[PDB]
Structure formats: structure tokens, C-alpha cells
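Appendix C. Worked example: Spectinomycin phosphotransferase
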Amino acid sequence: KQPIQAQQLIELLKVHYGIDIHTAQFIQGGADTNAFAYQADSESKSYFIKLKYGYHDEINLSIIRLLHDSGIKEIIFPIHTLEAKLFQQLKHFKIIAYPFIHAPNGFTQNLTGKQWKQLGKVLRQIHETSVPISIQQQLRKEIYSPKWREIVRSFYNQIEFDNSDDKLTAAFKSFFNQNSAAIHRLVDTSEKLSKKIQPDLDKYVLCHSDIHAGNVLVGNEESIYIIDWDEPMLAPKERDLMFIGGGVGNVWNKPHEIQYFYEGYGEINVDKTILSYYRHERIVEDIAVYGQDLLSRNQNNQSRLESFKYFKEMFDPNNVVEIAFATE
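Step 2, the predicted output written as C-alpha cells:
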């Protein structure tokens, strides 16, 4: 499926980046969807290369460039091509080169107070970044879609006994039934809050959209880096703020973290209705996705059990559900 043989990277990295690589190897399952990852090493360093088919504008690259030129420092930026571009466009595919870095994320290594402040400073920088109209036209907009809420409601009648259910499906239905009150509350609260929110496009800002602890790395100089810029969007700032104290992954649920974050972010006028809407809606989105994986046999059972564990963890003490309810 690969557009090139790994050794063809030697020629390409030399030509377009001026880098001499002595060894390149395909990285299995590293990339996802339309992407192929490779490890290419220079006698001096190691590089992570991503190839993507196509010549259309990738929103990730457009936004990464905007933040780069805007001065945001806390991003792991691509290595520049010799023409000073963040990626090399070839005839039928693109090359995106990055330094091969290992940095623990916020789950692995909890942020220090200083890092919480830096995260607040950087996210405020991002939210205040002026977005050129050409790029605004490329960004998805928050439209308060009822898609996920509808899917979870479609599950209601499926929770009924079915003689053909397998072990995982039956266990999931039992758990759903035992937590039915909380599940309907998540859906109904997200729905109620969406109805009360009057969309104001003038207040939308550039948002990461999924900035949980797994997407912050603590790297060189003990500085933080925000990763996964694949699906940014224009939406109320609360789309991102909901994660501070949000408890995603059973971390980022402590009062002092919130204090340090806002000392850095500065803006304390946060719309509580929109913040509560996102915390409930993000859980609804996950119940729809992981719940469907349990009601269906689309993935193997080892994978379905992982979805089940994830689904249940959302209901643990101090996890996302309890924090969402506490927000409302």
C-alpha cells in the first residue's frame, strides 16, 4: 500500500530536506487511515516520517503553519524542507518530516504547576490567534449536531434481552441497564443545554477540540507540547476549556490544576452552560462509539473488551461522568 519503498526515502530526504539518512524502516500500525510512518536515521539524529496520499490541503498542515508563523512555540513542528515549507508535496503524495522524539504525556507524567501555567498561556495564545478567512473556510464549525445524542437514544430499545447476544454484548447491556439513569441524564442534559445555547459565530475561536492529558507531552527543557492537530475547529473556547478539570483519563480532575491553568490562561469569564454542554456531549459521543462496538461484532473480542473497559471507566469515582454532573 506504501507509495514508496523505505529506501526511496534516502533519496527523497536528501533531495528535499538536505538530510543524509543511512537507514529507513517502515513503522507498522504506527499511522492511521491515509498515512504511512517510517523511522529514518541520520548519523546525527533520528527522524519520524509521515507519507500521505494526495495533493489537497491538509487542515493539520494549514493550522500548524498558522501557529508556527504566529509564534506559538509549544508544538512539535515538522522539519522544514529546503524551500522552508513544512511538508514536501510530490506528484501523488506528501512527505511530512519530524524529529523522532519521545516525550511522556500528561497521563504518564503529571504536569508541574509551572507547566499548568504554560499550558494555560499557550491555549490562550491559540484561542486568540487570528484566523485568515481562507483558513476559516477550511475549518469545521461547531453546529451542536444531535447525531450522537440520537445514536445513544437508538440504543435504548436494544438493551432488551436477546438470546443471541454474546458474552460481551450481554455484559454491556447489564452495565448499561445498571447505569441507565446516568446515561439518560448525560443525553438529556446535553440536549437541554444545546437548546439553551444561542450560537454566536463571532465568539468562535480556533480550538484544538480534544485537548486531554494524552495530547500534552512534557519534553525538552521541561516545556510542554500540544499534539494531535488533525481535527482542529472553530467553536466557543469552552470546547477546549472543558478539559481543564474535566477528568478525561482519570487525571486533570484536581482543583489546584484548575487554579494554575487559569493563572496562565488569564480569562476567567467562562460560559458555564457551554462548558457543561461539552462535558456531557463528549461523553455522549463516546457512549455512542464504544457502546456500538459492544452491541456489534465489528472488531474482535479483545478489542471489544478494551472498549468495554473504557466505557465503564467513564463512570468511576472522579471520572468524566461524575465531573460532568457536578458541572451542571
